[PDB]
Design brief:
It is classed as membrane protein. The entry lists the keywords calcium, calcium channel, calcium transport, ion transport, ionic channel, metal transport, ER/SR membrane, ryanodine receptor, ryanodine, receptor, wild type, membrane protein. This is part of a larger assembly, with two copies of chain A. The first copy, chain A, is mainly α and about 80 residues long. Helices cover about 65% and strands about 0% of the residues of chain A. Chain A has four helices and no strands. The longest helix of chain A is centred in the first third of the chain and has 18 residues, at about 1-20. Chain A starts with a helix and ends with a helix. The interface of A and B includes residues 40, 70 and 78 of A.
């Protein structure tokens, strides 16, 4: 379910940023991640929130559900 | 001089879930999430009743 909610959201943010183009000098830096950066480091960099803030994309809703599931895993294990 | 300088200057579906679980096990679980290295040895030395368990 997490990947189902993440992949479509990534594709949606890519399509939205492509319709609202606003061609500039930073759009290429933003869109190099889509072509370059194979899926391994792509998922590595789009899945990082343990500090206060990183370069996490717009789907912030799934971050909270991932935190809840991680706490559920911790309490299923011996971690208090 | 400025003119000279200017002249000089002019001259698909399950790969995503597999990679997700890989990244999760790589950077989400082993991130220092437990503290047992003192309680374990502390209760492992109590001879509640010889030789202690830690001594064994």
């Amino acid at each position: 379910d997490f990947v189902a909610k993440l992949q479509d959201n990534q594709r949606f943010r890519y399509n939205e940023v492509m319709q609202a183009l606003n061609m500039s000098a930073a759009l290429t830096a933003r869109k190099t991640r889509e072509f370059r950066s194979p899926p391994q480091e792509q998922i590595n960099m789009l899945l990082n929130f343990k500090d206060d803030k990183s370069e996490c994309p717009c789907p912030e809703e799934i971050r909270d559900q991932l935190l809840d599931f991680h706490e559920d895993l911790m309490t299923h294990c011996g971690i208090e | 001089x400025x003119x000279x300088x200017x002249x000089x200057x002019x001259x698909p579906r399950h790969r995503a879930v597999n990679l997700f679980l890989q990244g999760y096990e790589k950077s989400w679980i082993e991130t220092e999430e437990h503290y047992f290295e003192d309680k374990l040895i502390e209760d492992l030395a109590k001879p509640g009743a010889r030789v202690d368990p830690l001594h064994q």
